[PDB]
Amino acid sequence: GSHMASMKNAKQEHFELDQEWVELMVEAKEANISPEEIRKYLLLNKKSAHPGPAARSHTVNPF
Amino acid sequence: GSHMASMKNAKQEHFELDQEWVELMVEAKEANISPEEIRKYLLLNKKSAHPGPAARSHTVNPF
After folding, report:
1. A38 in helix, strand or coil?
2. Residues A7, A19: Cα–Cα separation, whole Å
3. Looking at the complex, does the CB of residue A17 fall below 8 Å from at least one CB of chain B?
4. What are the residue ranges spanned by the domains of chain A?
5. Does the beta carbon of A11 lie under 8 angstroms from any beta carbon of chain B?
């Protein structure tokens, strides 16, 4: 088969964000938006990226 | 006259709205929940503080 380009590393569940979350929070208290919608989503979504392999030895033979 | 308890005669137990929103803001940033839900809602919901609404269960007590 012919060669084709690809990304040097796998995708992760981690993403960049910062200043939207401080900007919404200050106004959401004065406007009385629902925090529960985020906190219940967040309570499930305590996410992390997939780990590396264990790389332990194995064989289809008795001890 | 006779001794009695001073004003205010009873405490209320309502917590700060800020302490949900401050934990939520820090944790939702690291979890990458949607800030766009709060920001799009806030742009319509340009509200301020108000008393509670009426309901069918409300009535004047006999005493």
Report:
1. helix
2. 29
3. yes
4. 1-63
5. no
